[PDB]
Structure formats: structure tokens, C-alpha cells
């Protein structure tokens, strides 16, 4: 095995024993963490690699003090990676705490929430988890150079909520998955930095003296790389056709898959692991790669080829930016909040390199093409593009095809023939688990991208996180339907509802984080991943009771389209559910409008009071009154509106007479009149009754 693969395998599994120690039930768990993991990884033939066993068994200080390991070995790198990732009585039943409550505990510290109110863990659960991981290591897992991604996938599948540390005196909020993953990434960066820099006596380099330990911690060893997608909000919103909804699901997925394939391809260039991707979502991406001249030259070269390709295909609609700024180990360990300083520096460099995107020769090259081309794509507003059959260009027709395939098939493959044009001379098509399996046994250089499917274990397992929900597929016809399937609802006016939401307090959350005590790279990674999981899984389950279709979900943007009533109800419900998930630490800013059917969805797109007072009190009163008393349709309510909108006392006296003439229960009339007499209550009343129609 290549020493790098040995290093990742050791690093990811150094603290594997902690779960079993916390298990307690089994006869293995009687001894300390390191040796425990040692005999446990020796139980399986595939993981019988001796060096990985050593890395696991010698991942802390006391063991290494007597470890008599060779002057060069990956174990020391693993030690340092765990240290940088990070009186000592560990409680085996410690539950994982949500970081979100800690994020805004400075303004209002509320009872800290714990995962599974005062929830406590049971050692039986740990026994069950150990049996599950024994099963995986026994049948599902096997060590090959290409299986490391599968190992990562199973680790994420199992450990994503078992706490990493269980110190009673420490504010535990790191899952073992996070700590292990960041350890793997950091260790890989260390290995590249030391090897390229022509140092081999790593024991002497770092283990020798504590002064050198702080010294290497201080040396600029890491590089923090950030990527930004230029024009998503424009290119996604040039849709006006009748099949608009099908494309939007296909277009957001197209940009998402672009970002995913480009980041994966980058990580392939770096000969590096997938654990190195700290955050993806929206048009952003964050990586922690090795700080080597080799790394920098590769990044620059790939940037050049990348910019070439996008200029070749869209030339203004989509562009990508690269930026990186040096960082050291001392920075990541949250010494003096300099983590936030470097985070802002990399953000600033990314945001000012976008100013200069085109060199001279490129800008000249653009302006002189008297090239014979056809005219704008109907579905996709682009002059430069050339249409074909039925007035559609190639890109949007492939978008239509993959949209057709989206609802039925769950797996997407990265293949060299495929359907949709993709950065690195590649194409994406759709597959099922069985032909994906055959592709795996076809030893083809493929990357299966899945639709929120765990326990796949198929080749390069990539449980891509995405919310693809559509109520139109819940009808008698499984085939995807047009926008009219939601317009034609008879329970109210035949219109459409649209909601957009952004976390208002997000810039500080990723930047400021938890101040002065928890701004570690580990905890930022945990925060980012938890936000990603919420905005990429929970929405899909929440939407199941609404006639709404998920369009753009991920990052901090939420885009749902459907019936007017269902959109409002789902917006309120998701607002409440999010307030639960962030424990009322993060809020939502949203706006909902009403538009007629088949309007260009491009232009379709360009809290407590509303629930308690309007929807719950006045709306229910009005609904009960209008249901009990007949003959009072939109005409009577519209006369109500004419009297209420024109805020004059003459209208109020007229409304008094109108309620005298109306045949409701006197309570309804009195309440309505007295609501109309207050400005706030009259506005709430008009809003509710407008909702009625």
C-alpha cells in the first residue's frame, strides 16, 4: 500500500476505540482506548495492515513515549493531526450537544440541547453500533486503494452523532465523525508538507522538544482554498417555457453537480482525500490543502484550464474564482481568534479577485468572432448559444432529458460518453443500483452520485445531499407534470405560491462562530455540516404534506413553489421546525408572492404575529362565520375590502350598517367591527380575509 493510503487509513481510525469503551458490555472494552482499537482492527483480514494498526494504537502521548517506533512513521503525523483537531474523566453516556445553541448563547444562554430535553445515551446503543460496524468491516468493507471513499461513506453513515470527546468539564459538541474526518484531512496535509519539503526524520522534526512542537505549530504548513461560482442567480432564472418546473429542478441540480464534479476532480489532482472538503453549498466551496509550491502550481494550472472551459461554454453566464491564503497550525487551533482573521482574509481575496477575471488576450479573443451562429434558446435565454430542433439548444435539451430521468432514477454517473456536457471532458447520465453494480464490476472509472441514499456501497459511494421533492409525482401518474398540475387546484384561486428564505445571521455564524473559546476548525466544520444536513434532508421530509416542489435547496437558500395556501402553511411550519433545530438561535427572512400560472418562472422568482393573530385567530373566526352563514361570497368580502382599504369614518359607519344587515352570529359581527376599528387589527383582518378568497 502507498504510504499515503496507509496514513489516511490510520488517521481516520485512531480514536475508533472510544465507542467500544463507551459500550462497556463486551469483554473487549476493559482496557484503554488505543490498545482496544488495536485488537478490534486486528479482528478483520482486510484491515490486517500492520502500519494502520500501529497508527491506531499509538495515537496519544503516553503510548508514543514508549512506542519505540521507527524514526519515520505515519503515527507521529496522526498524533499531531489529532492534537490540532482538538480532569479527564470520560463519561460513557455523554450525549452530543448541538453547536447552534452555543452559537448565540452569548446574547441569550438557553438550556443546552442534547441529542439521542435531558436526553442520555445508553451503553446498549454502543453495543449495537459496534455490532453494526463489525458487520460492515466483515462483509461490506475491504481495503483497496479506491475503497477509502467507501470507508469514509460508512464512517459518516454510522458515527455522525456519537460524541467524539466525553469530558465532563468540556463543552462537548464534536461528533466522532467530525473529529476523525478533520484528523484525516489535516494528517494528509501534514504528510504532503513534510514529504515535499524533503524532511524525513519527522520524530526529530516534531516529537523531539515541546519548543519545536509549538514551532511547527507556528510554521505556515497549510493552505486554505476557497471557490466561488459567479452567476448562479442569473443563469438559473432565465426560464420562461411551459416545462419550466422540470428544468428548474434540473438546473439547480445541474449547477450543484457541476460544483461537485469540479471539486472532486480538483481533489483528484491533489492526489488527496475527500475528507479535505470542509464545506460545499450554493456557489461556494472551502478546502484545506497542503501548503506546497507543487500544490500551488497545480491549483494555478487547473484554474487556468477551468477558466478556459467556462469561457468556452457560457462566457459570461457562469464563471468560477480561485483564491487561497496561507495559514499555520497555530491559526487553526484557535489561539487568539486569528481563525476569524484568516477566514475574512480568504473571503476578501476571493471577493476582490472576481474584479479581475479576464486577461488582455482573452478579452481581445472574445470580441473578434464573426462566427455563424443561430439564435436564443427558448428555455435558456442566451444569444451566444445556438438552437436546434424545436428551437432548443443541446444544453437545455439534455437538461430536459435528465429532468425526465430525475424523478424515477436515483443514481447519476460520471461517464465519458453520457448526456450532459460537464467540465473535464466528461458527461453525466442516470443509472440504477443494478447497472451501477455492473459498472463497478466493469472496473470503469466511474463516480456514482446518488439521491440521498445511504447503505449503497457501490463503487465510489457518493451520498450526494440534495432535496428533490415534487408533489406532482404523488398523483396517479408517476411522470413529471407541468406547472398546471399545481395551478388547477380548485380550493381557492388558480394561482401559484413561491417562497424564498435566507438565514439572516449566517455571515457571522460561519465567520464569527462561537467566540473566543470554540472557534476551532473542527467546530466550524461541525457547524457547517449540520447546517448542510438540515437544508438538504429535513426539508424533504417536512414537505411531504404539501402540494409543493423543491427547486433550489442548499447553502442558505430555500426555494419552494406550489399552491398559495400550501406555500404559506409550509413556510410557517418550516420556520417553526428550523427554530427547533437551531433551538431558536438562527432566524429566517422570507417573502411570498402570488402570480398567475405559466408565468416565466424566471420572473416568478426575481412571524409569530402572522401565525397567532392572523392565521389562527382572525382567519379561523372568519372561516367559521362564512361557513355557518351562506350567500356571502367574494362580493360581500370585496365590499368589506372597499370599506376597509379606504380608511375613512364614512366607510366605518357603512361597515356598521353592513354588519347589521349581515346574518352572522352577533359575536362575529361585533368582533369584526371592533377589529376594523383598530389600525393593526384592521390590517390583520384584511390580510386574513384576503387569504380566505
Amino acid at each position: 500500500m502507498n504510504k499515503k493510503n496507509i496514513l489516511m487509513y490510520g488517521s481516520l481510525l485512531h480514536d475508533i476505540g472510544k465507542i467500544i469503551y463507551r459500550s462497556g458490555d463486551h469483554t473487549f472494552s476493559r482496557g484503554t482506548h488505543s490498545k482496544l482499537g488495536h485488537q478490534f482492527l486486528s479482528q478483520f483480514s482486510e484491515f490486517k495492515d500492520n502500519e494502520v494498526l500501529d497508527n491506531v494504537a499509538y495515537h496519544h502521548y503516553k503510548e508514543l513515549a514508549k512506542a519505540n517506533l521507527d524514526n519515520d512513521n505515519t503515527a507521529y503525523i496522526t498524533y499531531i493531526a489529532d492534537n490540532i483537531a482538538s480532569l479527564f474523566n470520560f463519561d460513557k453516556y455523554t450525549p452530543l450537544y448541538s453547536v447552534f445553541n452555543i452559537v448565540n448563547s452569548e446574547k441569550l444562554k438557553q438550556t443546552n440541547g442534547k441529542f439521542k430535553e435531558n436526553i442520555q445515551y445508553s451503553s446498549g446503543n454502543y453495543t449495537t453500533l459496534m455490532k453494526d460496524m463489525s458487520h460492515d468491516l466483515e462483509h461490506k468493507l475491504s481495503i483497496k486503494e479506491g475503497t477509502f471513499p467507501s470507508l469514509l461513506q460508512w464512517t459518516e453513515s454510522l458515527w455522525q452523532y456519537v460524541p467524539s470527546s466525553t469530558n465532563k468539564n468540556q463543552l462537548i459538541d464534536i461528533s466522532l465523525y467530525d473529529h476523525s474526518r478533520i484528523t484525516c484531512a489535516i494528517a494528509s496535509c501534514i504528510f504532503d508538507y513534510l514529504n515535499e519539503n524533503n524532511i524525513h526524520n519527522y520524530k526529530d522534526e516534531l516529537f523531539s522538544k515541546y519548543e519545536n512542537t509549538k514551532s511547527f505549530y507556528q510554521k505556515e504548513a497549510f493552505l486554505l482554498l476557497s471557490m466561488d461560482m459567479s452567476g448562479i442567480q442569473d443563469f438559473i432564472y432565465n426560464i420562461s417555457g411551459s416545462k419550466a418546473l422540470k428544468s428548474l429542478r434540473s438546473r439547480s441540480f445541474y449547477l450543484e453537480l457541476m460544483l461537485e464534479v469540479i471539486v472532486d476532480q480538483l481533489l483528484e489532482r491533489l492526489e488527496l482525500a475527500r475528507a479535505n472538503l470542509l464545506y460545499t453549498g450554493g456557489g461556494h466551496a472551502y478546502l484545506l490543502v497542503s501548503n506546497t509550491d507543487k500544490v500551488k502550481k497545480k491549483i494555478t494550472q487547473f484554474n487556468n484550464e477551468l477558466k478556459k472551459w467556462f469561457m468556452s461554454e457560457f462566457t459570461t453566464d457562469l464563471s468560477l474564482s480561485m483564491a487561497f491564503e496561507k495559514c499555520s497550525g497555530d491559526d487553526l487551533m484557535n489561539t487568539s481568534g486569528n481563525y476569524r482573521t484568516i477566514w475574512r482574509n480568504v473571503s476578501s481575496k476571493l471577493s476582490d479577485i472576481k474584479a479581475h477575471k479576464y486577461s488582455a488576450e482573452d478579452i481581445l479573443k472574445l470580441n473578434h468572432f464573426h462566427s455563424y451562429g443561430d439564435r436564443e434558446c427558448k428555455e435558456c435565454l442566451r444569444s451566444d448559444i445556438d438552437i436546434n430542433d424545436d428551437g432548443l439548444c443541446s444544453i437545455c435539451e439534455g437538461i430536459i432529458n435528465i429532468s425526465n430521468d430525475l424523478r424515477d432514477k436515483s443514481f447519476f454517473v460520471l461517464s465519458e460518453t453520457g448526456k450532459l456536457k460537464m467540465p473535464f471532458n466528461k458527461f453525466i447520465s442516470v443509472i440504477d443500483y443494478e447497472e451501477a453494480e455492473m459498472l463497478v464490476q466493469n472496473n470503469n472509472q466511474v463516480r456514482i452520485y446518488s439521491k440521498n441514499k445511504p447503505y449503497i456501497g457501490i463503487g465510489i459511494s457518493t451520498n450526494l445531499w440534495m432535496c428533490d421533492y415534487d408533489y406532482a409525482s404523488q398523483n396517479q401518474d408517476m411522470r413529471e407534470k407541468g406547472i398546471g398540475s399545481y395551478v388547477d387546484r380548485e380550493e381557492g384561486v388558480k394561482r401559484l405560491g413561491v417562497v424564498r428564505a435566507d438565514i439572516d445571521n449566517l455571515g457571522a455564524t460561519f465567520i464569527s462562530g462561537i467566540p473566543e473559546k470554540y472557534n476551532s476548525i473542527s467546530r466550524t466544520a461541525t457547524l457547517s455540516r449540520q447546517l448542510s444536513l438540515f437544508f438538504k434532508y429535513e426539508l424533504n421530509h417536512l414537505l411531504e404534506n404539501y402540494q409543493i416542489t423543491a427547486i433550489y435547496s442548499g447553502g442558505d437558500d430555500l426555494f419552494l413553489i406550489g399552491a398559495w395556501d400550501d406555500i404559506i402553511e409550509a413556510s410557517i411550519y418550516i420556520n417553526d421546525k428550523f427554530k427547533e433545530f437551531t433551538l431558536d438561535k438562527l432566524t429566517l427572512s422570507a417573502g411570498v408572492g402570488m402570480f398567475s400560472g405559466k408565468y416565466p418562472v424566471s420572473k416568478m422568482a426575481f412571524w409569530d404575529e402572522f401565525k397567532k393573530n392572523i392565521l389562527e385567530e382572525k382567519l379561523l373566526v372568519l372561516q367559521q362565520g362564512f361557513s355557518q352563514t351562506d350567500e356571502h361570497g367574494k362580493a360581500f368580502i370585496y365590499k368589506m375590502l372597499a370599506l376597509l382599504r379606504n380608511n375613512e369614518a364614512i366607510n366605518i359607519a357603512r361597515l356598521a350598517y353592513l354588519l347589521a344587515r349581515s346574518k352572522m352570529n352577533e359575536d362575529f359581527t361585533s368582533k369584526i367591527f371592533n377589529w376594523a376599528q383598530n389600525d393593526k387589527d384592521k390590517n390583520q383582518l384584511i390580510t386574513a380575509l384576503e387569504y380566505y378568497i
Binding site: 361570497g633 367574494k634 362580493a635 370585496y638
Partner: protein, 192 residues
């Protein structure tokens, strides 16, 4: 070269219903006073004139789609309430826009389902301006004769919706013809 301005006012003999919202009527989203889009005027004149006869109708409005290209020669502009009507209605305390109630009879069933429609008040006055661009000297008399014929047909027809049902009849008054660019005499031209 010269430009000719046609300016005046139009009255609704019976109520008008353009109704872009539909049952609302077109308004300005802030002033809320109703208008008359120039597209309605242009389209009704073009339909009536074409149906009164394809070179002259091509010449006035311009098609420029049939392999031969003609620039439009007569430009219509939108309309707004006259100040006179606003003053008059404010003094007399008259609502700007009425709301007529209607029904429909189901055969074999004879149960009526109601209907609500919004209608511009009778007797209002709108202000309109036409711009004519004389590009051929020897054609102005014929073109203005044709536009007079179009006005004549429009006076005897309807604008907007439900015209056969009894709304949209209009009338033209206070029309003057003034040259504003160039040196073409516009005193021998008439539009009634």
C-alpha cells in the same frame, strides 16, 4: 423632414373595460387612476382598417415581418384622466369606477351563477396624443383620410371587453393638428 402631433381627448359614452388584471381594470399601481393602454387603441384601429378593405395598413402601423420591412409611421401613446374630470368628480363626490353585477342562466337548470365586473365610470375624459412621422410628401393626405376612416369606425364600435354586451362605446372631441418638428403645414388636415 417633419413631425405632426395629433392631440385631443376621448370620452366614454358607456363604460369602458380594458381589464388587464382580469375582474379588475388597468390602473397605475400607485396613483390607482385608470388609464387606456395604447396597444388597445392601435390594435382596434388596425383591425378595423384592415377589415375595411394590404399596402396602406402596412404603411401606417408597419408589419416588418413578411420579408419586406416597413417602419411604423404613426405612434400611439397611452392615455390618462383629464384634470377636468378629476376636478368635476371631486367636487361632485363621485367614485372613479363602478362595479356592475351580472349572472348567467344554465339551460335545463335555470340556476344563475353570479358575476362581478369592474367598469370605468361613464362620462370620464381621457387625454391622448398621436405622433405622425411624414416620410413621403405625396402620401400625407391619403394617410390622414385613412386615419379619419379608422376614427369613424372606432366611434361606431367598442374598445375593450364585452363590446357586444353593451360597453366600450367611445367618442372623440377637441382634436387639434399641430406640427412640432419641421416645416409642414398641418392646418388643412382634419380628424372628427
Amino acid at each position: 423632414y417633419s413631425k405632426i402631433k395629433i392631440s385631443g381627448t376621448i370620452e366614454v359614452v358607456t363604460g369602458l373595460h380594458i381589464g388587464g388584471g382580469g375582474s379588475p381594470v388597468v390602473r397605475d399601481l400607485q396613483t390607482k387612476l385608470p388609464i387606456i393602454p395604447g396597444s388597445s387603441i392601435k390594435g382596434k384601429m388596425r383591425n378595423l382598417l384592415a377589415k375595411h378593405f394590404d399596402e396602406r395598413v402596412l404603411r401606417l402601423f408597419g408589419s416588418s415581418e413578411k420579408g419586406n420591412i416597413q417602419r411604423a409611421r404613426l405612434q400611439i401613446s397611452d392615455a390618462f384622466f383629464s384634470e377636468k374630470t378629476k376636478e368635476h368628480f371631486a367636487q361632485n363626490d363621485i367614485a372613479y369606477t363602478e362595479t356592475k353585477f351580472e349572472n348567467t342562466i344554465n339551460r335545463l337548470t335555470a340556476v344563475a351563477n353570479p358575476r362581478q365586473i369592474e367598469r370605468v365610470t361613464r362620462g370620464s375624459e381621457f387625454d391622448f396624443v398621436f405622433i405622425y412621422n411624414v416620410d413621403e410628401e405625396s402620401q400625407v393626405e391619403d394617410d390622414f383620410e385613412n386615419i379619419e376612416k379608422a376614427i369613424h369606425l372606432l366611434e361606431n364600435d367598442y374598445l375593450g371587453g364585452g363590446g357586444t354586451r353593451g360597453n366600450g362605446r367611445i367618442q372623440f372631441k377637441d382634436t387639434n393638428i399641430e406640427t412640432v418638428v419641421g416645416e409642414y403645414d398641418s392646418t388643412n388636415l382634419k380628424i372628427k
